[PDB]
Amino acid sequence: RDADTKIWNGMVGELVYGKADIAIAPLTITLVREEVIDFSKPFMSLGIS
């Protein structure tokens, strides 16, 4: 999110604003992304290393 204009960018913006249908991509499952688009059960696990 842009902090003031309150529009999404990126691939999450492409899904919210109807441009695309599915984001088969390394998109991290976060809280603030979950509220505006649904996420699958995660297909790959990772962490800080």
Partner: peptide, 10 residues
């Protein structure tokens, strides 16, 4: 067809 968005990262 279905639009699959993704990004160019190896």
């Amino acid at each position: 067809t279905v639009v699959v968005t993704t990004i160019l990262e190896s």
